[PDB]
Write a protein that binds this ligand. Structure first.
Ligand SMILES: O=c1ccn([C@@H]2O[C@H](COP(=O)(O)OP(=O)(O)O[C@H]3O[C@H](CO)[C@@H](O)[C@H](O)[C@H]3F)[C@@H](O)[C@H]2O)c(=O)[nH]1
Ligand SMILES: [K+]
Length: 452
């Protein structure tokens, strides 16, 4: 029996897609083991119980939180707040190498699918002649855009923050500004973050190949560009969440089709009260019906009497929303998102246009994919790459209101809903037998069966 070990980093945006990839391999009669940590194991155990479905095994590693100076309870990337904790977090995940090499010698699996943040996992798997696959959890376009920006540095031929530059080599003219790039790369360059990106991008060529959570038909110019111009060996097997298939739902049943906006900013939602306030003011001015998801830890971010003033039109969800069931409801016709790839794929899979609100990571590249290339989105005006949010950087009510109207009744809004409806169909087509993603998932497994 073929055995594949999955080693995601401890971040929700990477753990959930990695689990879905493990389920996909399990459905093809492949033994799948996921490596996690004790305080994260609940995320997988809960999500495994959703049967008669093949069994996915968990292996728990000790996270050296004390060895790197992290709180003992900091085993997840969403608790490492600030620059100091995040650098301590990546020193900690690096110390997992010993447990990984011990586990690889013990079990001797046929393949290691390891997170993009583990470039050294290629060497660790080589000690036992195990091929290593990289998983990023993002689009081909972000993979290509990150690499072209790293190699050609078009941000040095610029003189001011908002001065635009084109992305080299791309089959589309993509305009970007340095302000959308991390200051760690263009302002006060610190070798720490630059060497980590170098090792991550290099591992895509040094390893056996790349698993990509996308489908070929979604971004074919960049599925090819990644393989040919950038020389990577890759397989598009996404959307991986698809082949594994409440009060707010009753609230929507009585609503018009494609007239409600869904607002949710992911699992990494670090939202401050002044920013939530501008969103509340902008939602009121729009007049649009909405489902708004906020987090927890009350009048310090809400206008007085807000919930009661919009009771018949608006709903605020404070817990964990059933995002997939909400977006695929008929009433939902717009999605304000932070352009994380997992939720961007869910917007595409449901055929819902999006208001793009990038914050950090590769979200600004995903915004370009959604707005300029796929043309199913509208920018909100956010263009400042930042891990946390400064009150100086808050997006005001006026920008949010125009984006809420543009996505609902603005120019081409009915064509964007139509374009998203095809992408929806192509997404389900890609994952069924004979589809693009179903096909080279079989091609990856067959290649793994015959690795010498
Ligand atoms: O209230 C809620 C809130 C969330 N969810 C679910 O959590 C997922 C959110 O997707 P998302 O890509 O935004 O995850 P995130 O960790 O923030 O993004 C990082 O990981 C991404 C993957 O690489 C990366 O692209 C990005 O830059 C990173 F920031 C998505 O699958 C939802 O279904 C929910 O069900 N209910
Ligand atoms: K090349």
């Amino acid at each position: 029996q073929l055995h594949v070990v999955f080693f995601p980093i401890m971040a929700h945006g990477h753990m959930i897609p990695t689990l879905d990839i493990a389920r996909l391999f399990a459905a093809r009669n492949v033994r799948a083991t996921i490596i996690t940590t004790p305080l994260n194991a609940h995320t997988f155990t809960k999500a495994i119980e959703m049967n008669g479905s093949p069994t996915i095994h968990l292996e728990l590693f000790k996270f050296p939180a004390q060895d790197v100076g992290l709180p003992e309870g900091c085993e997840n990337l969403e608790q490492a707040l600030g620059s100091s904790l995040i650098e301590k977090f990546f020193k900690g995940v690096g110390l997992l190498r010993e447990q990984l090499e011990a586990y690889l010698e013990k079990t001797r699996p046929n393949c290691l699918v390891a997170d993009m943040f583990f470039p050294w996992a290629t060497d660790s798997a080589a000690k036992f002649n195990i091929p290593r696959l990289v998983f990023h959890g993002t689009s081909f376009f972000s993979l290509c855009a990150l690499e072209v920006v790293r190699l050609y540095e078009p941000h040095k031929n610029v003189s001011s923050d908002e001065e635009l530059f084109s992305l080299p080599l791309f089959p589309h003219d993509i305009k970007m500004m340095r302000l959308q790039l991390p200051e760690d790369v263009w302002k006060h360059e610190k070798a720490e973050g630059k060497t980590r990106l170098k090792l991550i991008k290099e591992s895509e060529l040094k390893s056996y190949g790349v698993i990509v959570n996308s489908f070929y038909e979604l971004e074919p110019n960049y599925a090819e560009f990644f393989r040919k111009e950038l020389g990577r060996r890759a397989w598009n097997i996404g959307p991986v969440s698809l082949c594994n298939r409440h009060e707010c739902l009753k609230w929507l049943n009585s609503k018009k089709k494609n007239s409600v906006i869904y607002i949710c900013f992911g699992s990494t939602a670090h939202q401050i009260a002044p920013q939530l306030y501008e969103i509340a003011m902008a939602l009121e001015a729009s007049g649009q019906e909405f489902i708004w998801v906020v987090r927890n830890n009350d009048d310090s971010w809400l206008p007085r009497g807000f919930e009661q003033r919009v009771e018949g039109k608006g709903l605020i969800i404070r817990g964990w929303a059933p995002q997939v069931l909400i977006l695929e409801h008929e009433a939902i016709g717009a999605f304000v998102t932070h352009c994380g790839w997992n939720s961007t794929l869910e917007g595409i899979t449901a055929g819902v246009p999006m208001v793009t609100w990038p914050i950090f990571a590769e979200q600004f590249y995903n915004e370009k994919l959604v707005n300029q290339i796929l043309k199913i989105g509208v920018p909100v005006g956010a263009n400042k790459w930042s891990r946390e949010t400064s009150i100086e950087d808050v997006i005001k009510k006026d920008a949010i209101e125009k984006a809420l109207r543009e996505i609902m009744v603005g120019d081409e809004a009915e064509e964007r809903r139509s374009r998203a409806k095809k992408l929806k169909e192509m997404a389900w087509k890609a994952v069924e037998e004979g589809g693009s993603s179903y096909s080279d998932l079989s091609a990856l497994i067959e290649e793994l069966r015959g690795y010498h």
